[PDB]
Amino acid sequence: SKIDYLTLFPEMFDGVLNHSIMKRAQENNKLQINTVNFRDYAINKHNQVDDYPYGGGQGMVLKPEPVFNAMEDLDVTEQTRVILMCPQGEPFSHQKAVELSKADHIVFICGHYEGYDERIRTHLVTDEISMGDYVLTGGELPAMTMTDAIVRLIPGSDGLLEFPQYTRPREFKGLTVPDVLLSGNHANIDAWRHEQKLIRTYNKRPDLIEKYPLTNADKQILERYKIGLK
Numbered sequence: 510s511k512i513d514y515l516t517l518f519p520e521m522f523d524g525v526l527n528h529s530i531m532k533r534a535q536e537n538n539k540l541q542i543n544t545v546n547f548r549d550y551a552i553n554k555h556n557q558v559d560d561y562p563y564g565g566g567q568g569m570v571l572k573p574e575p576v577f578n579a580m581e582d583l584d585v586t587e588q589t590r591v592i593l594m595c596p597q598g599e600p601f602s603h604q605k606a607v608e609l610s611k612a613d614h615i616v617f618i619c620g621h622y623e624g625y626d627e628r629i630r631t632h633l634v635t636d637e638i639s640m641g642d643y644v645l646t647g648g649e650l651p652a653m654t655m656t657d658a659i660v661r662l663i664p665g666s667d668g669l670l671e672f673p674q675y676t677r678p679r680e681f682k683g684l685t686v687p688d689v690l691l692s693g694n695h696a697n698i699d700a701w702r703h704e705q706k707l708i709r710t711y712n713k714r715p716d717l718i719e720k721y722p723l724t725n726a727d728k729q730i731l732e733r734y735k736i737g738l739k
């Protein structure tokens with residue numbers, strides 16, 4: 510499997526591909542990653558990859574020819590998935606990460622451009638994906654985050670919040686690890702962790718409690734808690 514990124518700043522990805530999961534999986538002969546710069550396929554008078562929009566508008570638009578050429582050199586096939594980092598795209602999701610981990614070749618089109626030529630979108634892009642309602646400067650960090658979640662799904666819940674976890678030391682600033690965790694009584698350790706899960710969910714995410722098949726023990730735990738409050 511292989512991932513290629515079209516970027517103006519191929520060096521933003523320095524140290525994110527040479528370390529962690531990217532370093533591991535790429536070393537392991539699992540994924541080939543290539544960075545590709547624009548303006549390496551530009552032919553404009555200033556070697557530009559953006560020009561002004563027909564009809565007017567404030568911004569500048571990425572031109573189609575450098576991008577189709579970039580797809581050409583990257584040996585994009587009819588089954589390659591070309592992902593446009595688009596602020597109005599479908600929000601990225603675990604479902605989509607599972608879907609994309611099934612893909613032999615992937616290309617991210619990254620860029621700060623206010624606009625993209627519609628030719629690119631109609632005949633080149635297979636996928637347009639957002640990071641969320643917030644506004645970013647470019648598609649490079651989105652591209653890398655999505656790559657993280659996808660690569661992690663390469664061969665290389667219960668409905669509640671997590672239970673608190675503690676490690677050494679037992680005491681720190683007078684803040685004491687709960688004693689049940691050191692008693693070596695695993696039935697109590699698990700019962701306590703479950704109680705904390707119910708209580709933390711009740712306090713911070715009551716919607717999750719509503720969608721949870723509460724037992725009679727769970728109801729009693731929450732009721733003893735909310736009475737212990739008063």
Ligand SMILES: N=C(N)NCCn1cc(-c2c[nH]c3nc[nH]c(=O)c23)nn1
Nearest residue numbers: 594596621622623640644645646647648
């Ligand atoms: N087309 C416009 N407005 N570009 C402006 C500059 N920009 C933004 C993005 C972008 C990519 N992915 C995102 N996910 C969530 N919000 C975002 O803003 C983005 N890429 N370039």
